[PDB]
């Protein structure tokens, strides 16, 4: 019923494209993690950490000079407002002894690096790619996690071996904690794809290619309950929350043409990237505080366009 939603728009430019990009709030500064997924003659890994200073992306610092060639890799950043820890580990063929490397900064430019060695990682026969994560407090400390999903099981022998979450305790220095998630909708022969765990308000949430709202069970064993967001060709692609109720966008087709956003089944406004020959893919419900939000997708080559949200409750 009684909600006032102040929505608004902004514009970014970038000279070269970056396909998969990461977005967050650090000290209320709009940041970015670029993609150069080109391993060819004239391009290598070139991951530029970009702040949009009022018009367009400004690379605060690069990342390729520290980790020389290791690896593909998979990027994981934890958003503390004073510090962000970045690790890089490559794609899966034999080795579990996996020397990776660790990053530290308090700004976007001046980086401290850290040689680590995650040898015999327990994500063998687990599947992960890059995503943004947050702290998450269980009773002792806030915690950082790395959650490898089982894509396929022949038999539903146990609902504990689905998502395997190695957790840290010391910003990501040592990962001496493994966390179990229970998934109760485990339909066999349906190989679940590309898990995206986001964090909302010291709670757990997994999302993949369905949505599962997720909760604590034990110190290490957790659970996810089921929840619908599916309608006629209306997949779920990203969701944040304000006041712990969801904000929903859609992938209406297979082209990711123009995403569809509703006012929580009360009203509706429309994403309009034409008033070209492109889409609304990569949409990022960037979370600010209890009452404000942002939205940035990827339409075409080097053009990002912000959709800014102001939202509190009058009654």
């Amino acid at each position: 019923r009684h909600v006032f939603i102040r929505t608004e728009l902004s514009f970014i430019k970038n000279n070269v494209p970056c396909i998969r990009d990461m977005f967050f709030i650090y000290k209320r500064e709009l940041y970015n993690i670029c993609l150069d997924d080109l391993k060819g003659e004239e391009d290598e890994t070139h991951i530029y950490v970009q702040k949009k200073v009022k018009d367009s992306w400004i690379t605060l610092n690069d990342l390729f000079k520290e980790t020389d060639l290791t690896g593909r890799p998979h990027i994981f950043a934890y958003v503390d407002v004073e510090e962000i820890i970045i690790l890089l580990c490559e794609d899966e063929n034999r080795k579990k002894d996996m020397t990776c490397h660790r990053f530290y900064s308090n700004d976007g430019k001046e980086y401290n690096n850290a040689e680590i060695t995650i040898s015999d990682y327990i994500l063998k026969d687990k599947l992960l790619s890059s995503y943004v994560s947050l702290p998450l407090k269980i009773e002792n400390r806030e915690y950082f996690l790395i959650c490898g999903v089982s894509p396929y099981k022949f038999k539903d022998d146990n609902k504990k071996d689905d998502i395997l979450c190695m957790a840290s305790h010391d910003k990501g220095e040592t990962w001496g904690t493994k966390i179990v998630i229970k998934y109760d909708n485990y339909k066999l022969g349906v190989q679940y794809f590309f898990l995206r765990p986001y964090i909302s308000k010291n709670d757990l949430s997994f999302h993949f290619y369905n949505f599962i709202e997720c909760t604590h069970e034990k110190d290490l064993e957790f659970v996810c309950s089921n929840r619908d967001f599916l309608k006629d060709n209306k997949v779920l692609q990203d969701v944040s929350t304000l006041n712990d109720e969801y904000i929903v966008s859609y992938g209406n087709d297979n082209n990711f043409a123009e995403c569809y956003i509703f006012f929580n089944n009360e009203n509706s406004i429309l994403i309009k990237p034409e008033k070209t020959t492109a889409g609304c893919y990569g949409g990022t419900f960037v979370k600010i505080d209890e009452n404000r939000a942002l939205f940035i997708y990827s339409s075409s080559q080097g053009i990002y366009n912000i959709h800014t949200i102001y939202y509190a409750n009058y009654e």
Binding site: R20, D125, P151, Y152, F154, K187, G189, V190, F193, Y209
Partner: protein
């Protein structure tokens, strides 16, 4: 060849189950096991004459199953035309195959002559007891030792669940000729699933028939010709038993080797095309 395999193993049991009436013949199994060597030589090497280009055809399955690590139909034509070359190779070494198995008719029945009796109203059962028990009954405990019915529930679930990955993942991936090759492998394991399935019904029916018939054979007598009727009859129980289980182990090895094969195929596609 399956009725030849029944035929060879059948006359092996007419052979031995004939020649163990005479308890002084405990060393003739060197000669007849040496003829099992002979039929492994002649039978197995004649059926490896086809494994020149059939071992090359196993290498052609290698030509198929990785580009790295339309022509489905078009070289499927070459595959089935060279399968007319398969049953053609069986068809023109067929001279040799019939020579081998009917030579097992020869040495087999000439070992059936070697049984005798002191009197025909009642004879020894040192034979079927000593050879069934000391050569067969533990294999009877092998196939009795396995719940291959709940394992048919397993392999049934393998085709069910593999049709679920085929359903949702063909429903998603589709794109290149990978789906056509995967479907060829899947239907192959379904035909083999039929083989395994009915020969498990040979286990459930026929193994119970070994249980029923096994009381009328050893530790007893007959008027001699009825005892001989149970040498031939129980030799048929042994023929379908052993033939069915050796089929079960060739298709068991090829089966679960293919289970790791298509298992890493379902753990092989997202690693390449990188979904999202």
């Amino acid at each position: 060849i399956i009725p030849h395999y029944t035929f060879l193993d059948y006359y092996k049991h007419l052979s031995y189950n004939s020649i163990y009436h005479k308890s002084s013949t405990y060393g003739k199994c060197i000669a007849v096991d040496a003829f099992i060597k002979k039929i492994n030589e002649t039978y197995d090497k004649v059926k490896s004459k086809c494994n020149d280009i059939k071992n090359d055809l196993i290498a052609t399955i290698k030509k198929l199953e990785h580009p790295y690590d339309r022509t489905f139909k078009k070289m499927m034509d070459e595959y089935n035309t060279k399968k007319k070359k398969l049953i053609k190779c069986i068809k023109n070494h067929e001279n040799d195959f019939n020579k081998i198995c009917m030579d097992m008719k020869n040495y087999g029945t000439n070992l059936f002559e070697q049984l005798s009796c002191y009197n025909n109203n009642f004879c020894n059962t040192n034979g079927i007891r000593y050879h069934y028990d000391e050569y067969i009954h533990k294999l009877i405990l092998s196939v009795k030792s396995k719940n291959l019915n709940k394992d048919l529930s397993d392999m049934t679930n393998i085709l069910q669940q593999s049709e679920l990955l085929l359903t949702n993942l063909n429903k998603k991936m589709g794109s290149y000729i990978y789906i056509d090759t995967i479907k060829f492998i899947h239907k192959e394991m379904k035909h083999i699933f039929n083989r395994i399935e009915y020969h498990t019904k040979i286990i459930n029916d026929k193994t119970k028939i070994i249980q029923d018939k096994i009381k009328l054979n050893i530790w007893r007598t007959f008027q001699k010709d009825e005892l001989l009727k149970r040498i031939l009859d129980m030799s048929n129980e042994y023929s379908l038993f052993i033939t069915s289980d050796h089929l079960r182990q060739m298709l068991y090895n090829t089966f679960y080797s293919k289970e790791k094969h298509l298992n890493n195929i379902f753990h092989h596609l997202i690693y390449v095309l990188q979904m999202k």
